[PDB]
Amino acid sequence: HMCDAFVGTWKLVSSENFDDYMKEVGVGFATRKVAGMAKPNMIISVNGDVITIKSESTFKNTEISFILGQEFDEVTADDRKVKSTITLDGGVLVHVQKWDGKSTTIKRKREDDKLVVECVMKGVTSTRVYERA
Numbered sequence: 001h002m003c004d005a006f007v008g009t010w011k012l013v014s015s016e017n018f019d020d021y022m023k024e025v026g027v028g029f030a031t032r033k034v035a036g037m038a039k040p041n042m043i044i045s046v047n048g049d050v051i052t053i054k055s056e057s058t059f060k061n062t063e064i065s066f067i068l069g070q071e072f073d074e075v076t077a078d079d080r081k082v083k084s085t086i087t088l089d090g091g092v093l094v095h096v097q098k099w100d101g102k103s104t105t106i107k108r109k110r111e112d113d114k115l116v117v118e119c120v121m122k123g124v125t126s127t128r129v130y131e132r133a
């Protein structure tokens, strides 16, 4: 029941400072423009210890499956090859991606009827708000 309140299908309803986050990450111009237009569906499900998070949009369809605390390979929507570890910290899913000596952290939290995603790269934060689909 670890992630019960995350499970479901969620639709992006607002984004703030995502272009600057993508710049900080190293995403190039054309990908930033097309990715920034996307209104993804995030689909979260749990089967035993395995959590699956899908992102579906006109830009890309991606999927990760993982066990909390257990590092995995991830190819991101912008085509980074990263090493990821996801943990639960006080009811927040904390997802750290490492690549090329760099690091970014994505936090996913339930707040009221929303799922709030905070993406941080150094000093730059983007906040993406999802509601139930």
Ligand SMILES: Oc1c(SC(F)(F)F)cc(SC(F)(F)F)c2cccnc12
Binding pocket: 021, 022, 025, 027, 035, 036, 038, 039, 040, 055, 056, 057, 059, 060, 076, 077, 078, 106, 117, 119, 128
């Ligand atoms: O919502 C997100 C998109 S847009 C979409 F989903 F359509 F791929 C793209 C990326 S990778 C990038 F930031 F480098 F661009 C995201 C990373 C973390 C959370 N959300 C993300």
